Paper text:
The 14-3-3 family of eukaryotic proteins are abundant, medium sized proteins (~30 kDa subunit mass) endowed with a well-characterized phosphopeptide-binding ability. The human 14-3-3 family comprises 7 isoforms (β, σ, ζ, γ, τ, ε, η), that form all-helical W-shaped homo- and heterodimers. More specifically, 14-3-3 s bind protein partners that have phosphorylated serine and/or threonine residues presented in a specific molecular context. To aid structure determination, we have developed a streamlined approach based on chimeric 14-3-3 proteins fused to the sequences of interacting peptides.
Thus, the C terminus of 14-3-3σ was fused to the N terminus of the HSPB6 peptide comprising the key Ser16, which is phosphorylated both in vivo and in vitro by cyclic nucleotide-dependent protein kinases A (PKA) and G (PKG). The linker used for fusing the HSPB6 phosphopeptide to the C-terminal of 14-3-3σ∆C included: the ordered Thr residue at position 1 that is always present in electron density maps, even for C-terminally truncated 14-3-3 variants; the natural Leu residue preceding the 14-3-3 binding motif of HSPB6 (RRApS16APL); and a GSGS segment designed to provide maximal flexibility to create the prototypical 14-3-3/HSPB6 chimera CH1. Two crystal forms of the pCH1 chimera are remarkably distinct differing by the relative orientation and packing of 14-3-3 dimers in the crystal. In one crystal form (pCH1℧), the C-terminal lobes of each of the two subunits within a 14-3-3σ dimer are in contact with one C-terminal lobe in each of the two adjacent dimers. They form an interface along the length of the α-helix 9 of 14-3-3 stabilized by contacts between pairs of residues Tyr213/Tyr213′ and Gln221/Gln221′. In the structure, pairs of subunits belonging to two different 14-3-3 dimers are linked by a reciprocal interdimer phosphopeptide swap, in the course of which phosphopeptides, fused to the C-terminus of each subunit, cross-patch into the AG of the adjacent monomer. Lying just outside the primary 14-3-3 binding motif, RXXpSXP, this residue has no clear electron density suggesting its conformational variability. Notably, although being very short, the GSGS linker was long enough to allow phosphopeptide binding to the 14-3-3 monomer of an adjacent dimer. Consistent with available 14-3-3/peptide crystal structures, in the pCH1℧ structure reported here, the phosphate moiety of the peptide forms salt bridging interactions with the conserved 14-3-3σ residues Lys49, Arg56, and Arg129 and a hydrogen bond with Tyr130. The comparison showed that the two different approaches provided almost identical structural information, with the Cα r.m.s.d. of 0.23 Å for bound peptides. As expected, the chimeric protein CH1 co-produced in bacteria with PKA was specifically phosphorylated at the authentic Ser residue (Ser16 of HSPB6).
Residue numbers in the entry:
A (entry chain A): -1 to 70, 78 to 243
B (entry chain E): -1 to 71, 77 to 243
C (entry chain B): -2 to 71, 76 to 243
D (entry chain F): -1 to 70, 76 to 242
The structure:
Amino acid sequence: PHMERASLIQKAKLAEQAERYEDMAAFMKGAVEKGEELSCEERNLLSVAYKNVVGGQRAAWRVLSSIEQKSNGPEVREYREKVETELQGVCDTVLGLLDSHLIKEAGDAESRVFYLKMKGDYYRYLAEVATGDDKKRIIDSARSAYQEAMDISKKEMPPTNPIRLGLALNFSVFHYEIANSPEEAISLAKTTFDEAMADLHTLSEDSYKDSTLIMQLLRDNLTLWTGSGSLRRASAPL
Amino acid sequence: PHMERASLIQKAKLAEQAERYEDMAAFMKGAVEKGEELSCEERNLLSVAYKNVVGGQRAAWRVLSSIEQKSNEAGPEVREYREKVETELQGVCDTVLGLLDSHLIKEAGDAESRVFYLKMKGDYYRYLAEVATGDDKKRIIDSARSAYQEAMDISKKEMPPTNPIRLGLALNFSVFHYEIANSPEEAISLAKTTFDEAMADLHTLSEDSYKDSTLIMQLLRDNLTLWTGSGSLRRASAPL
Amino acid sequence: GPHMERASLIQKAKLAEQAERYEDMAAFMKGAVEKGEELSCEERNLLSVAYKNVVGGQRAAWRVLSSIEQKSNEAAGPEVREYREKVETELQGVCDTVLGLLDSHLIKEAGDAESRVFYLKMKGDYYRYLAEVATGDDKKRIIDSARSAYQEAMDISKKEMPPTNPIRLGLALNFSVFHYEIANSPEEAISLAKTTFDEAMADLHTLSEDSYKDSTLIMQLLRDNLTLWTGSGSLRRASAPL
Amino acid sequence: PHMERASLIQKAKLAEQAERYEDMAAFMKGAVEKGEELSCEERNLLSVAYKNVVGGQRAAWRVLSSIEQKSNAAGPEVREYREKVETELQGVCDTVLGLLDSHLIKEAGDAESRVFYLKMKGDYYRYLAEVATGDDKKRIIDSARSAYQEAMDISKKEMPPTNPIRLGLALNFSVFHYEIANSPEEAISLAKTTFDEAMADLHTLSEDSYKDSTLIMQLLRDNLTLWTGSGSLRRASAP
């Protein structure tokens, strides 16, 4: 390690505690640029930082795009465009770090799934706002990243692993919202849930909370997408 | 025919594998009547047997009551047959409640067994309440409430929030609040509390209860989404 | 032109609020103030909301970092100090921006009592935020600048506004916080807080339905602080009066 | 002496103004035993009289029980005197519960009066629970809970969420949950639900109605901060 890198990682941990996500992101970018492999803890810092930064831009873009769609003055279009351009710049930064530093085709496989999933996520966020001729390319870039990640996770991780579950949840969202394949989405989400449910006896104690949380999100999306809400209430199985 | 306790339990296990729930129920009733306590495995056999028997009667009653409710817009066969299924269902609930009161419920044995039976008492009074329309309805609802309340009091002092009997109990009592007692707010807030307290204590869970606890936590979340109208909400992506 | 620009900026600040984009909202509201016209009651609230949210996050961060830094001085590690200093400098820059707008545009050009009190209260607030982080020889000056702004605002609000007015209540609540946390006058704070609450409670019959929610919300914050500061929160639970 | 019903009600109003609660209680017990329903104003006089009488006994019992618990044999005077106060308190609760069961609950016509008395029955069983110790405590706790639950069921169907008897009932049943039944979570949930459902319909009230209800909503908020520990949080500044 570089010690600049060690100091930047320490400052990213301080920025997380302080809920200063743009600083956290800047510190984690700097750390990625000052070294090779990130540890599991350091990969999560990078992801949390940029998740929170784009999360707010995406939430804003949705509000503005919703106002623009209903009002159809030039201020809404212009401001929606400002937020959109800013969001695109963050996604380009994350995708640049992944391609130039983090994604290693001959590296550790588990870390390769995390980054390839992250590459699919940030191309998917670009696809959420893309309306040009470039849209098809963006959608395909996200699909390839997720497909490459899915292929590795199936060979290398158990079906209860939270990175593998997270990956399948996000790729099903991609199918539903982006690729307009709601049936593939429902299918993948049901398969992921059922394969993880069958392998619950081999769930390690540390993965328990993260895996069951993501399995709940899969079940929540399945209910939303199939219209399984309004069905009869459940009582205990025993 | 070997109808000694050990043989009735063995036949109850065969009946389960064969999906012969009325035989299972009869074998388990017979095993309870030897005047002895049930193990955790044996309590589950008793519950599975009667849950399957009463479940088919309830499902049938709902179909018939639904046909009877639409029909008035009427031959007497629907009312008569709905009444036949109701009476039969009431007899099973009375059998289960009789076994619980005369043999199984004690003050006291171990907390998990006490809670299990009191939860079972609230469940079978709740099934009687589902079909009750007379002056006796209030009494039935109160009998279900007391059983669940006594069970809730023991489970809070004696069991961890992730225990599946404690989770199952809270899930069923929240259903009782929503459907039977017409207290949808109490139901939502019990379901949310149960889920949140179990979610915080997930580190202290075993391989045995893993599947049972997370399955019941999923049912709590499913009911919360149905009852709060949270279905409509934005799709989830990974927290990662 | 500037008149169409001013209108666009205020409209974008309303969009930025809906989108929870407070730094943009602040920038749009600064730009609108720099058109040199007075702000309406609605526009004053947009300005205040924008900068309250911006500085709110910086202050919350500063408190976390200062708390981590204080626990390391009892084997760190200069990163906490350095990062706490970064957040503080950034916070100071926002307070200086707000205080500059108030002094150069808003306070000098305020017509009515409600707008004049609003801005003087805001001046007291942002000097109080500078006082929250100040440890130099400049500390005493900052505290006094805050006190004078609040005192001038209190003098106008007592002559010109009813005791239920939410700007007057907000002012009193913040000046009591200044007394408790900044000036180390917890008795003056409890006093002021109790007096403000009691005088507003007596004049509740003369409250409009518009200001009822804003006034009762601020009266709730006054009694919440009174409970915290007097330790009355530890008292026996209430049951029904009949 | 003028001991006709209306004069007993007039004398109870005078005893309230004079803070003579044992006389007030005796005047309202006397008016109840005339065999007519109590009006809304009259029900409040009955409740105020006995809440003040039992309140002083409860406050005393708490002081004495605290001295007896701390005295750690000692002198027997504390136990004996705590027992005297306890027996006296139990007698007042038995008097109120006897009036409710023999005259007021049976004869109540409307929902508001039915709820009022059932809430009052839960309260006085809760006061008996405060001084009971073992399996005696079980018995009493469940009489309190049933009275409260029956009252809650009627108030939800028959009264708006801003009604002060419905608010008072929820506040007391939440106290029962927290202190007596050891269910701090449903106490906190019931109090927040009650506050939030009442706050959503406050615009409908007059100034008198608004005052009565907002006082009980403040007590719900006060208990919520005590029970959730929200009072120890960072001080508020203006929004």
